[PDB]
C-alpha cells in the first residue's frame, strides 16, 4: 500500500526485498508531508540559493549558431556549487533524512559526481556519509574520491560483480537493508524503486521552472525544445518536468551511443536495450540474452547507469518525449566546439545533449527553432580524457 | 505435486524439524556442484534451496556474492542450471527443491515461461528475493498455474496485514526472516520470532522455515523449539565450499559432517 | 598628461617605455568614457549576469564558527564562470578592447587562472588571444594551459629571466610595445601602470557592492571586517572598494607567508618587501639587495605576483586597510577545515583569507564579530597539491 | 664635463656622424667584456652605450635578454659594473659613456646616490628605459645635479608637446627611436624620421642619435643623410658576442670588422 502510484504506466514499481518496504513507505510519507510543509520548503530554498547558488544563468550562445535560424540557450547547472546538477536534489534528500530522524547517509556513485554532491550536503548538514563506488570506478576517478574524502565521507570500493556502478547500487541497498532505522539511502538519479523517481524529479524541477521563467523573459515564448542527456534521468527530468503539460514544447533526451548503437558498445537502454527488473524497478536495461545485467559504455563517465528512469520510459511510450543517441565522436566534437566558440568547457555527459542540438541546427539550418540545452555539469574534470584522445589521434 | 506437504506431514510424525541447506548451482563448477548437492542429501538434508547465479544478488552478503562469482567463473548459465535441476530431480523423487531467484532472471524470457520450465524440471517452489508481496501478483499466479509454490518472506518487521497476505498467498513454506540485512553467517538474528510463528499458524500459513544467519546446531533446535517447521542454512554451507576449493575430498567430508550435525539438531 | 591622478599617494605611476604612453593614455580615456556610457554598462551587466552568473551567493558558515561569537559569511566568487573572480574584470576589459577597436588580446598569467579567464572572454567576444606564461609555470600548470588552448588561445611559454610570472609580465609588455595599435593588454591584477589599478578595481567592485547589499539584507548591518587574499590585489580591492568610505568596516588583506616571514621564503612584499619601480609602477616589491626583482613563494600558485597593487600600499600607509600574512601550513589547515565542515573546497589562495578569519575567531572566541571572507576561487585545481602534501606527511 | 658637446663639435668639423655601439657590461664575463669594449673603441666607436644587467629588461628583445642572462651567469652585479665603468673611464679620457638603466636599479639605493656614483666613475649620460618624460622629474634633476646628461626618448609617435619637452629637458643627445617594439636587429625601422629631426633642431634639442634595429652601414649613412648626429647599434653587436662565445679571438676580430665598417659609413 502506498500514497502514490509507484508506476508510470507499466514502468517503475518497488522491486526490493520485503525487508526494505517499510523504509520506502516511510520515505514516501515523509516526502508527501515535506511537500506540504512551508518550513521544509523554506529551508530547501535557503540552501539552494545561499549555498548552491541558484538561480543558475540561462546563457544565449550566439557564436555557435551564427548563420542559421537556431537560437540556442544553455541552462547553466555547471555553475551550481559542486559543478553539476546533482547538488540540487541531494540538498532536498538530506533535509528529508533529517525530517525522518536519520543521521547517516548512504550513496552510490559511478563517475563520482553524485558521491561528491552527497558528501558536500552531508558535511554541511552534519550527517555521517558513506559512499559505495565500484572498485574500477574508484581507480579511474581518484580526483573525485579524494574530494569525497576531504569532505569527510567514507568511500568504500566495491569489488563484487563488475566492480562498477551497478555493483555499487547493489552494495548501497545491501547496507540500507540492515541500517534503514538510522540511515537514509540518497539515491543519485531519477530511477530505483518508488518513491525515488518521483522525489528526484521534484527536487530537480527548479531547473525547468527557472528555464521557463528565463526564456519567457528573454524571448517572450516557450522553447521549441529542451534537450538533456540521459544517464539515469535526473537532469533531464528536472529540465522536462515543468514543460510536460506545455505540449508545444519538445522534450528530447539523449542517451550515449558509445562506439555506435550497431557495435553494442553503448549506453542507450531506453531505445536499444530490453525491459528488465533490477535496482527496484521495471525499466529498459542493458542486459545479456539470459538476463544478466550489463554495463553501459560511453566516453563520458557519468552516463554509466545501465538502465533509465521509469518516467522517461513512460514519456517515451506515450510519445510525449523523444529519445535519441549521440556517439562518443559526436560528443567530443560538441565539447571542442563549445570550448572554442563560447568559452565554456562542458561536461562530456552534457556534451551529448549539445551534440544533438548542433545536429538539429546543422541538419536544417534554415529552420527557425528556439532550443535550450541543459548544461548539467562543467567539463574541467574531462580535460585529461580529451587531452589523451586528441593526442592519440595526432590532433595535438 | 505436494512435496512440501508430504515432507512436513512426515516430519510431524517423526517429531522433527526440517533442515534445508542453500547452495548456488554450479559453484564451484557444474560437476562439483552436483556432487555437493548429492552429499547434502545423503547427509540428511530434508529439502534444498538452490540459487541460480545472478549478476546482481542484492539480498546476499559476501559469502554468497562470491559463490555467484565462482559459478560465473565456471561459465554457468541459467540454462545449464535448469539442466542440473532436471538431473537432480531425476535422481531424487521426493525431496522438495526450492529456487532462490532474482526478478530479472524470472522476467527475462517471460514470467509464465519461467514457471513452466520449473514445472518441467520438477522444481517445487520459487522465492524471488527482490519481489515483495506488493509486487508479487504475476509471479505467484504463474507459480500456481504451474504447480510451483510461491515462497513469501515474513520479515521480523511484519504487521498483521502482511502476516495475513503471506498466509493466504503462500504455499510450500513461509520464509521466516531472522533479521534485517542480507544473507550471511557472520550475523546472527537476535529477535525472538515465536509471536510471528504463532500468528502464521493462526492464519493457516504454509509451515515456517527460519532463514538468515543460521550456522549452528543450537539455532536449528531453537527454531524448532520456537514452533517453526525447520531452518535454512546458506552461508555456513557455502563457506565450507569456499574454504575447501583446493580439496574436493575434504570439502565433501566437511559438508557431510556439517549437514549431519545440523539435521541431528532438528530432533524435537 | 592624464585625466586621472596616476598615483595613490606615493604609489603607482606610469613607469613604461615612452613608446607605450599613448596606449595608456588611450586606455584611460576609453575607460573614463565607458564609465559614463549606459550602453557599455548594460553590455557589461548582461555578460556578468547571463554568462558569468552574477550575482554570486553569500554563504553563511555556521559549522565552522559553532561555539564562538564569530558569524562568518563567504562571498562565493568560486561559483563564477571560470571558478574564480578573474572572470569579472576580463569581461569589462574585453569590452574596452572592442570600444577602442582592438581585435587582439595579450595577457600574462602565473597560475593560469587569469589566462583561462582571458581565453574564455576572448572566445566569447571574438578576439584573438595570446597568453604569456613563464615556462616553469607552463610545466607546472598543464591543466590550465590545456584549458586555454581548448578555448582557442595561443599560449606562449616564456624562457627568459626566471621563467615565471614576472617574466611573462615583461613579455606581455614587450609584445604590446610593438602591437598596441591592434592589441589590448588585458592585465590580470590591480597593479601595473595607470590606468590598470583603477580599471581593475572598478571592474571588480561588484564583489563588495553585492556583499554590502547581501549582508545588510541578512544581518541588518555592515560587516565588522571583510578579508581577502592579496597576490596582486584584484579580488581584495574588488571586495574592499565599496566599503572604503564605510570607515567602521575593517579591510584586511592577507599576503602569503610561505614557509614563514623569517625564512625569506614568502610572498608578502607589502609588509615585508621593499618599495621599488617595476612593471610600470612604484610599489613594494620582492627584490634582492641590489635591486633585481625576485619571485614570490607560496604553497598557492596564484599568490605569485612579486609586488602588490599601489592602492593597497596606499590604503595601508594611511591606515585604512590592514595587511597580514598566513603561512602555507595555516592555509592548508583552513583548506581542510572548510572541506570537512562546510562541504566547500576553497582555492589555496583564498584559503589564506579564510585562515586569517579562523585566527581572528579562535584567538578571541568570545568576541562578537561579523566577518566576510572573499572566496575568490574554487579549490578543485588544488587537490593534487594537497594530496601530495598530506601523503608526504603520512596523513594519508 | 662636456664630453658629448665636445664630441659633436669635433664630428661636425669632421663632417661625420657618431657611431655608438651598445653592449651589456659583464657579457660574457667581466674580463672579456672589458676587452670587448676596448676593441669597440679601438675600431672606431665615437661613444658607448652600456647596459647594467637587470632581471627584467622589458624594453629589450631576445638578443639583449640573452646578454643580460649571460652576465648573470657570470655573477655580474651592479657594483661590479660600476668598478668596470671606473676602469673604462680611467683608460679613455674623452669618449662619452652612456648607461642604459632600468628604473629599479636607479631607485634601489636612492636616485640621488645612483647619479652621484655615476659622476664619481665618470659616466656622461643615463637613459632609463622604463621612465617616460611624464615620470622623469627626479631622475633628470639628480642627473643634472651630478653633471650627468638625462637621455630622453623621442618616439616616432611623438607630438609637438613631447618634442618640446625632450628638447628642453634633455642633454647630451636625444634618442631618436626608429620604430615601436623592443630592441633587436631582426626588425628594421620603416618610418622616415627627418621631420622629427628637423623639429628637434628647431627646438634646440641635444643632437639626435637614431637607435633600434640599426645593423647595417646603409642605415648609418641614412641616419646622417636624414640630419641625425649619428646612430646606435646594440643587438647587431651583441649577436657577434653570442655567435662567438666559443672563440674570444674570432669574437674580437668580427667586432672590430663590424664597428670599423659601421663607423666608416658615418662619413657624410
Ligand atoms: C556530470 C554528470 N552529468 C550527467 C550525469 C547523468 O546523470 P542523470 O541522467 O542526470 O541522472 C552524471 C551522472 N553521474 C552519476 C553516474 O555516474 C554519478 O556521478 O554517480 C554526471 O556525473
Ligand atoms: C584563484 C586565484 N585566487 C587569487 C589570486 C590572486 O590574485 P589577486 O590578488 O586577486 O589579483 C589568483 C591569481 N592568479 C594569477 C597570478 O598567478 C593568474 O592566474 O595569472 C588566483 O588564480
Ligand atoms: O544462511 P544465510 O544467512 O546465508 O541465509 C540463507 C539464504 N539463502 S536463501 O535462498 O534462503 C535466501 C532467502 C531470501 C533471500 O532474500 C530475501 F529475503 F530478500 F528474499 C535471499 C536468500
Ligand atoms: O640595435 P638595437 O635594436 O638592439 O637597439 C639598441 C638598444 N640599446 S640602447 O641602450 O640604445 C636602448 C635604448 C632605449 C631602450 O628602451 C627605451 F627606448 F624604451 F628606452 C632600450 C635600449
Ligand atoms: Cl502495474
Ligand atoms: Cl607623485
Ligand atoms: Cs542564430
Ligand atoms: Cs496457505
Ligand atoms: Cs557562531
Ligand atoms: Cs637641450
Ligand atoms: Na540511459
Ligand atoms: Na602580495
Q: How far is the CA of A124 from the centre of ligand 4 (A)?
A: 60
User: C184 has which bridge partners?
Assistant: C105
Nearest CA to ligand 4 atom 8: D234
Residue A273 makes CB contacts below 8 A (sequence gap 6+) with A284, A285, A286, A287, A307, A308
Cβ-nearest to A124 among C120, C123, C342: C342
Can you read off the three cell numbers belonging to residue C50? Answer: 547571463
Partners of D99 in the β-ladder: D50, D126
CA gap C362, C360 in Å, rounded: 6
- Residue D227 falls in which region: left (phi positive, over 0), alpha (psi -120 to 50) or beta: left
Q: Which residue of B has its CA nearest to A18?
A: B132
Same fold, A7-48+86-201 and A54-83+205-392: yes
For Cα atoms C122, C125, C140, give the angle at the middle one, nearest 5 degrees: 15
CA distances in angstroms from D235 to A107, D51, D76, listed in the order given: 66, 12, 20
Torsion of CA D196, D200, D205, D206, to 10 degrees: 40
What's D126-180 look like in SS3? EEECCCCHHHCHHHHHHHHHCCCEECCEECCCCCHHHHHHHHHHCCCCEEEECCC
φ and ψ of A209, to 5 deg:
-60, -45
Q: For ligand 11, an ion, list residues with CB under 5 A.
A: A 230, 255, 308
The C-alpha cell that represents D265 in the structure block: 659609413
Contact at 8 Å (CB) between A81 and A177? no
Just give the CATH number of A7-48+86-201: 3.40.50.1100
Q: In this complex, which of B60, B65, B132 lies closest to A16 when CB atoms are compared?
A: B132
The CA–CA distances, whole Å, from C116 to C152, C183, D221 equal 11, 18, 49
Cα distance between residue D24 and residue D53, in whole Å = 7
Residue with grid cell 613631447, as numbered in its chain = D162
Which residues lie closer than 8 Å to C73 by C-beta, 6 or more apart? C58, C59, C60, C61, C214, C215, C218, C223, C370, C371, C372, C373
Q: Which residue ranges make up each domain of chain C? A: 17-48+86-201, 53-83+205-392
Taken in order C142, C148, C153, C156, the sign of the CA dihedral is negative
d(CA C255, CA C268): 5
How many Å is the Cα radius of gyration of chain D?
17
**Is the link from the previous residue into B28 a cis peptide, with omega within 30 of 0?**
yes
Place of cell 602569503: C256
CB contact set of A329 (below 8 Å; sequence gap of 6+) = none
Calculate how far, in angstroms, residue A71's C-alpha sits from the geometric centre of ligand 7. 5
Relative to beta strand C225-229, strand C369-375 is: parallel
Interface contact A51, partner C, CB < 8 A: yes
Residue A264 phi, psi (nearest 5): 80, -10
Nearest to C353 by CA among C264, C257, C224: C257
Q: How far is CA C74 from CA A54, C58, C65, C239, C321, in A?
A: 16, 6, 12, 11, 19
How far is the C-alpha of C123 from the C-alpha of A354, rounded, in Å?
Answer: 18
CA-based radius of gyration for chain A: 20
* Peptide bond connecting A55 to the previous residue in cis, omega within 30 degrees of 0: yes
With contact defined as beta carbons under 8 Å apart, do A340 and A270 qualify?
no
State the burial class of residue D53 (Cβ atoms within 10 Å of its Cβ: 0-12, 13-18, 19+): buried
Name all chains with 3 or more CB-CB pairs below 8 Å to chain B.
Answer: A
Q: CA dihedral defined by B208, B214, B217, B221, rounded to 10 degrees? A: -30
Q: For A51, which of C59, C380, C383 is closest by C-beta distance?
A: C59
Is any atom of ligand 4 closer than 6 Å to the C-beta of D170? no
Instruction: For chain C, give the secondary structure using H, E and C.
Output: CCCCCCEECCEEEEECCHHHHHHHHHHHHHHHHHCCCHHHHHHHHHHHHHHHCCCCCEEECCHHHCCCCEEEEEEEHHHCCCCECHHHHHHHHHHHHHHCCCCEEEEEECCCHHHHHHHHHHHHHCCEEEEEEEHHHHHHCHHHHHHHHHCCCEEEEECCCCCCHHHHHHHHHHHHHCCCCCEEECCCCCCCCCCHHHHHHHCCCHHHHHHHHHHHHHHCCCCCEEEEECCCCHHHHHHHHHHCCCCCCEEEEEEEEECCHHHCCCCCHHHHCEEEEECEEEEEECECCCCCECCCCCCCHHHCCCCCCHHHHHHHHCCCCEEEEEEHHHHHHHHHHHHHHHCCCECHHHHHHHHHHHHHHHHCCCCCEEEEEEECEECHHHHHHHHHHHHHCCCC
User: Which one-letter DSSP state was computed for residue D267?
Assistant: B
| C-alpha to C-alpha distance for B18 and B5, rounded to whole angstroms | 12
Question: Are A151 and A140 within 8 A, CB to CB?
Answer: no
For residue B63, give the C-alpha cell: 559469502
Residue B183 grid cell: 544473507
Task: Please give the order of strands across the beta sheet that includes A128-134.
Answer: A154-158, A128-134, A104-109, A183-185
Q: Are D23 and D43 in contact (CB under 8 A)?
A: no
Instruction: For residue B157, give the H/E element and its range.
Output: none
By most ligand atoms within 8 Å of CB, the mutation choice from D67, D180, D232, D236 for ligand 4 is D232
The residue among B63, B108, B113, B160 with the most chain A CBs within 10 A of its CB, best to mutate, is B108
Q: Are strands D97-101 and D48-51 parallel, antiparallel or unpaired?
A: parallel
CA distances from B148 to A249, A373, B114, B170 (A): 50, 52, 11, 10
Residue C95's nearest CA partner among C105, C109, C85, C107 is C105
User: Using an 8 Å Cβ cutoff, are B55 and B24 in contact?
Assistant: no
A284 close to A315: Cβ distance less than 8 angstroms: no
Choose, from B27, B46, B49, B254, the residue flagged as catalytic: B49
Enumerate the β-bridge partners of residue A250.
A225
Quick one: B41 exposed, middle or buried, by C-beta within 10 A (0-12, 13-18, 19+)?
middle
What is the C-alpha separation between A232 and A255, in angstroms, rounded? 9
Q: Do you find a cis peptide bond into C55, omega within 30 degrees of 0?
A: yes
> Which residues lie below 8 Å from residue A335, measured CB to CB, with a gap of 6+?
A345, A346, A348, A351, A354, A379, A382, A386
- Around ligand 3, the residues with Cβ closer than 6 Å are A 17; B 22, 49, 59, 64, 100, 127, 129, 153, 177, 183-185, 211-214, 232-236
Say if CB D94 and CB D3 are below 8 A apart: yes
Instruction: Give the number of other CB atoms < 10 A from CB of residue A395.
Output: 10
Separation in Å, CA B88 to CA B7, B100, B122, C348: 17, 16, 9, 67
CA-based nearest residue to C239, from C62, C67, C55, C77: C77
Contacts of D109 in chain C (CB under 8 A): 290-291
Q: List, in order, residues 6 or more apart from D226 with CB less than 8 Å away.
A: D192, D193, D194, D197, D210
The C-alpha atoms of residue C308 and residue C313 are separated, in whole angstroms, by: 7
Do you find a cis peptide bond into C151, omega within 30 degrees of 0?
Answer: no
Distance from CA of B209 to the nearest CA of A (A): 16
Chain-centre distance for alpha carbon A63:
28
Resolution value, angstrom units: 1.6
By CB atoms closer than 10 A (0-12, 13-18, 19+), residue C67 is exposed
Q: Which ligand is nearest to the CA of C65?
A: 9
Atom of ligand 3 nearest to the CA of B213: 3
Q: B212: CA distance to ligand 3 center in Å? A: 6
- Binding-site residues, ligand 1, Cβ < 6 A: A 84, 109-114, 165, 188-189, 229-235, 302-305, 347, 349-350, 376-377
How much of chain D is helix, strand and coil, in % rounded to 5? Answer: 50, 15, 35
Closest C-alpha to B67, from C139, A61, B76: B76
- What number does the ligand 4 atom closest to the CA of D213 have? 3
**Which residue among A59, A126, A383 places its CB closest to the CB of C146?**
A383
Cross-chain residue pair A344–C120, CB shorter than 8 Å: yes
Quick one: cell of A3? 500514497
> What is the whole-number distance in angstroms between the Cα of residue A321 and the centre of ligand 5?
21
Q: Report the catalytic residues of C.
A: 61, 85
Of the candidates A57, A340, A343, the beta carbon closest to that of C53 is on A57
| C-alpha angle D114-D117-D119 in degrees, rounded to nearest 5 | 110
Segment (H or E) for D212: none
Indicate if the alpha-carbon torsion angle C105, C111, C114, C119 is positive or negative. Answer: positive
Q: For D245, which DSSP code? A: T
Nearest CA in chain C to D180: C178
D14 vs B217: CA distance, rounded Å: 125
Let me know if A157 is exposed, middle or buried by CB neighbors in 10 A (0-12, 13-18, 19+).
Answer: middle
> What angle, 0 to 180 degrees and rounded to 10, lies between the N-to-C axes of helices C142-150 and A383-392?
70
Q: Whose CA is nearest to atom 5 of ligand 2?
A: C302
Phi, psi of A154 (to 5 degrees): -90, 125
Q: Which residues pair with D175 in a beta bridge?
A: D153, D209
b/e string for D227-252 if b means 16 or more Cβ within 10 A? bbbbbbbbbbbbbbbbebeeebeebb
Is B73 near chain A, with CB under 8 Å?
A: no
CA distance A275 to D229: 92
Residues of B in contact with A279 (CB under 8 A): 56, 58
Q: Do chains C and A touch (3 or more CB pairs under 8 A)?
A: yes
Partner A contacted by C164 (CB < 8 A): no
State whether residue B248 is helix, strand or coil: helix
Q: How far is CA A184 from CA A95, A114, A234, B158, C162, in A?
A: 11, 15, 19, 21, 55
In our burial notation (b when 16+ CB lie closer than 10 A, e otherwise), range C282-317 reads: bbbbbbeeebbbbbbbbbbbbbbbbbbbbbbbbbbe
Of D209, D212, D248, D241, nearest to D226 (Cα)?
A: D209
Residues in chain A: 396
C121 touching A, CB under 8 A?
Answer: yes
How much helix, strand and coil, in percent to the nearest 5, is found in chain B?
A: 50, 15, 35
> Is C114 part of the contact surface with chain A (CB cutoff 8 Å)?
no
Rounded to an integer, what distance in angstroms lies between the CA atom of residue D156 and that of residue D178? Answer: 7
Residue ranges of D 2-41 with Cβ closer than 8 A to chain C: none
Residues of chain A contacting C121 with CB distance shorter than 8 Å: 343
3-state SS string for chain A: CCCCCCEECCEEEEECCHHHHHHHHHHHHHHHHHCCCHHHHHHHHHHHHHHHCCCCCEEECCHHHCCCCEEEEEEEHHHCCCCECHHHHHHHHHHHHHHCCCCEEEEEECCCHHHHHHHHHHHHHCCEEEEEEEHHHHHHCHHHHHHHHHCCCEEEEECCCCCCHHHHHHHHHHHHHCCCCCEEECCCCCCCCCCHHHHHHHCCCHHHHHHHHHHHHHHCCCCCEEEEECCCCHHHHHHHHHHCCCCCCEEEEEEEEECCHHHCCCCCHHHHCEEEEECEEEEEECECCCCCECCCCCCCHHHCCCCCCHHHHHHHHCCCCEEEEEEHHHHHHHHHHHHHHHCCCECHHHHHHHHHHHHHHHHCCCCCEEEEEEECEECHHHHHHHHHHHHHCCCC
Chain A interface test: which of C76, C116, C120, C150 (most A C-beta within 10 Å): C150
Residue D202, number of CB atoms within 10 A of its CB: 11
Q: How many CB atoms lie within 10 A of CB C388?
A: 10
- Of C19, C276, C278, which is closest to D177 when you measure between CB atoms? C19
Q: Choose from C10, C15, C181 for mutation: most chain D CBs within 10 A.
A: C15
Show which of residues 198-217 on chain C sit within 8 Å of chain A, judged by CB atoms: none
Residues in Cβ contact with B117 at an 8 Å cutoff, skipping those fewer than 6 apart = B82
Question: Looking at the complex, does the CB of residue B177 fall below 8 Å from at least one CB of chain A?
Answer: yes
Phi first, then psi, for residue C11 (nearest 5°) are -110, 145
Closest CA to C189 of C237, C157, C248: C237
Name the closest residue on chain B to residue A25, using Cα atoms.
Answer: B134
> Would you call B13 exposed, middle or buried from its count of C-beta atoms within 10 A (0-12, 13-18, 19+)?
exposed
* String of DSSP letters for D45-105: -SSEEEEPP-S--TT--HHHHHHHHHHHHTT--HHHHHHHHHHHHHH-SSS-EEEEE-HHH
Distance CA C368, CA C65 (A): 11
Q: Which residue has the cell 556474492?
A: B65
Q: How far, in Å, are C6, C284, C313, C314 from residue C9 at the CA level?
A: 9, 13, 9, 6
Residue of A nearest to B60 (CA): A174
Q: Give every CB contact of residue C130 below 8 A, 6+ residues apart in sequence.
A: C104, C105, C106, C107, C153, C154, C155, C156, C175
Strand ranges for B74-168 from DSSP E? 97-101, 125-128, 149-150, 153-154
Q: Whose CA is nearest to atom 1 of ligand 1?
A: A377
C-alpha–C-alpha distance, residues C291 and C275, integer Å: 10
Specify whether the CB–CB gap between D9 and D96 falls below 8 A: no
Please indicate whether, in this complex, the C-beta atoms of C123 and A341 are within 8 angstroms of each other: yes
Q: Please answer whether residues C287 and C274 qualify as being in contact, where contact means their C-beta atoms are separated by less than 8 angstroms.
A: yes
What residues of A are in contact with residue C336 (Cβ under 8 Å)? 150
CATH architecture of residue range(s) C17-48+86-201? 3-Layer(aba) Sandwich (3.40)
What is the rounded CA–CA span in Å between residue A354 and residue C351? 35
CA-to-CA distance for C331 and C348, rounded, in angstroms? 7
Output the CA A231–ligand 1 centroid distance in Å.
6
Distance of CA B59 to the CA centre of its chain: 13
Q: How far apart are CA C333 and CA C354, in angstroms?
A: 10
C-alpha span between B184 and B59 (Å, rounded)? 10
Q: C45-55 burial, b for 16+ CB within 10 Å, e for fewer?
A: eebbebbbbbb
CA distances from A377 to A2, A331, A349, C1 (A): 34, 14, 8, 50
Q: What does the alpha-carbon distance between residue A187 and residue A189 come to, in Å, rounded to a whole number?
A: 6
* Helices B78-91, B30-43: inter-axial angle, 10-degree rounding: 40
- The Cα A298–Cα A261 span in angstroms is 11
Task: Give CATH for domain C53-83+205-392.
Answer: 3.40.50.1100
Look up residue B20 and give its DSSP letter.
E
C-alpha cell read off for B191: 529477535
Nearest-neighbour CA in chain D from C220: distance (Å) = 47
Domain boundaries, chain D: 1-268
The matching CATH number, chosen from 1.10.10.10, 1.10.238.10, 3.40.640.10, 3.40.50.1100, for A54-83+205-392 is 3.40.50.1100
Provide the 10 A C-beta neighbour count for residue C217.
9
CA separation for the pair A274, A272 (Å, rounded): 7
Query: Ligand 12 center to residue B166 CA distance, Å?
Result: 74
Amino acid at each position: 500500500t502506498t500514497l502514490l502510484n509507484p508506476y508510470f504506466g507499466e514502468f517503475g514499481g518497488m522491486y526490493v526485498p520485503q525487508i526494505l518496504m517499510p523504509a520506502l513507505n516511510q520515505l514516501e510519507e515523509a516526502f508527501v508531508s515535506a511537500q506540504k510543509d512551508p518550513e521544509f520548503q523554506a529551508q530547501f530554498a535557503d540552501l539552494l540559493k545561499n549555498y548552491a547558488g541558484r538561480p543558475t544563468a540561462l546563457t544565449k550562445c550566439q557564436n555557435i549558431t551564427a548563420g542559421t535560424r537556431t537560437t540556442l540557450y544553455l541552462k547553466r547547472e555547471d555553475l551550481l556549487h559542486g559543478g553539476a546538477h546533482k547538488t540540487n536534489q541531494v540538498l532536498g534528500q538530506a533535509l528529508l533524512a533529517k525530517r525522518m530522524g536519520k543521521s547517516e547517509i548512504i550513496a552510490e556513485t559511478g563517475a563520482g559526481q553524485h558521491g561528491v554532491a552527497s558528501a558536500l550536503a552531508s558535511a554541511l548538514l552534519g550527517l555521517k556519509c558513506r559512499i559505495y563506488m565500484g572498485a574500477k570506478d574508484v581507480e579511474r576517478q581518484s580526483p573525485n574520491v579524494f574530494r569525497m574524502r576531504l569532505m569527510g565521507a567514507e568511500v568504500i570500493p566495491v569489488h563484487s560483480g563488475s566492480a562498477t556502478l551497478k555493483d555499487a547500487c547493489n552494495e548501497a541497498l545491501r547496507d540500507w537493508s540492515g541500517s534503514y532505522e538510522t540511515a537514509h539511502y540518497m539515491l543519485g538519479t531519477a530511477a530505483g524503486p518508488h518513491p525515488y523517481p518521483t522525489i528526484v524529479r521534484e527536487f530537480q524541477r527548479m531547473i525547468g521552472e527557472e528555464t521557463k521563467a528565463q526564456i519567457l523573459d528573454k524571448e517572450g515564448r516557450l522553447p521549441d525544445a529542451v534537450i538533456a542527456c540521459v544517464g539515469g534521468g535526473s537532469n533531464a527530468i528536472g529540465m522536462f518536468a515543468d514543460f510536460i503539460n506545455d505540449t508545444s514544447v519538445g522534450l528530447i533526451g539523449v542517451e550515449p551511443g558509445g562506439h555506435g548503437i550497431e557495435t553494442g558498445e553503448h549506453g542507450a537502454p531506453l531505445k536499444h536495450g530490453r525491459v528488465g527488473i533490477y535496482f527496484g524497478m521495471k525499466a529498459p536495461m542493458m542486459q545479456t540474452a539470459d538476463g544478466q545485467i550489463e554495463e553501459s559504455y560511453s566516453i563520458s563517465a557519468g552516463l554509466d547507469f545501465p538502465s533509465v528512469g521509469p518516467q522517461h520510459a513512460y514519456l517515451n511510450s506515450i510519445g510525449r518525449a523523444d529519445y535519441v543517441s549521440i556517439t562518443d565522436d559526436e560528443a567530443l566534437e560538441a565539447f571542442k566546439t563549445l570550448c572554442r566558440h563560447e568559452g565554456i568547457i562542458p561536461a562530456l555527459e552534457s556534451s551529448h545533449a549539445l551534440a544533438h542540438a548542433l545536429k538539429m541546427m546543422r541538419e536544417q539550418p534554415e529552420k527557425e527553432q528556439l532550443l535550450v540545452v541543459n548544461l548539467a555539469g562543467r567539463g574541467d574534470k574531462d580535460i585529461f580524457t580529451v587531452h589523451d584522445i586528441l593526442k592519440a589521434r595526432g590532433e595535438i | 505435486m505436494e512435496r512440501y506437504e508430504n515432507l512436513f506431514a512426515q516430519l510431524n510424525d517423526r517429531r522433527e524439524g526440517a533442515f534445508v541447506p542453500f547452495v548456488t548451482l554450479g559453484d564451484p563448477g557444474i560437476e562439483q556442484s552436483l556432487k555437493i548437492i548429492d552429499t547434502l542429501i545423503d547427509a540428511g538434508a530434508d529439502a534444498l534451496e538452490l540459487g541460480v547465479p545472478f549478476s546482481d544478488p542484492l539480498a546476499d552478503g559476501p559469502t554468497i556474492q562470491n559463490a555467484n562469482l565462482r559459478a560465473f567463473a565456471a561459465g554457468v548459465t541459467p540454462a545449464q542450471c535448469f539442466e542440473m535441476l532436471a538431473l537432480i530431480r531425476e535422481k531424487h523423487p521426493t525431496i522438495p527443491i526450492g529456487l532462490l531467484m532474482y526478478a530479472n532472471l524470472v522476467f527475462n524470457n517471460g514470467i509464465d515461461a519461467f514457471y513452466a520450465r520449473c514445472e518441467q524440471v520438477g522444481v517445487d517452489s520459487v522465492l524471488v528475493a527482490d519481489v515483495p508481496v506488493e509486487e508479487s501478483a504475476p509471479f505467484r499466479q504463474a507459480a500456481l498455474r504451474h504447480n510451483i509454490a510461491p515462497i513469501f518472506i515474513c520479515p521480523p518487521n511484519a504487521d498483521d496485514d502482511l502476516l495475513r497476505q503471506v498466509a493466504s498467498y503462500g504455499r510450500g513454506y513461509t520464509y521466516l526472516l531472522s533479521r534485517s540485512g542480507v544473507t550471511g553467517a557472520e550475523n546472527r538474528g537476535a529477535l525472538p520470532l515465536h509471536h510471528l510463528i504463532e500468528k502464521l499458524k493462526e492464519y493457516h500459513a504454509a509451515p515456517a522455515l527460519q532463514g538468515f544467519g543460521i550456522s549452528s546446531p543450537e539455532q536449528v533446535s531453537a527454531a524448532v523449539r520456537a514452533g517453526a517447521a525447520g531452518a535454512i542454512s546458506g552461508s555456513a554451507i557455502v563457506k565450507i565450499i569456499e574454504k575447501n576449493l583446493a580439496s574436493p575430498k575434504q570439502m565433501l567430508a566437511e559438508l557431510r559432517s556439517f549437514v549431519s550435525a545440523m539435521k541431528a539438531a532438528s530432533r524435537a
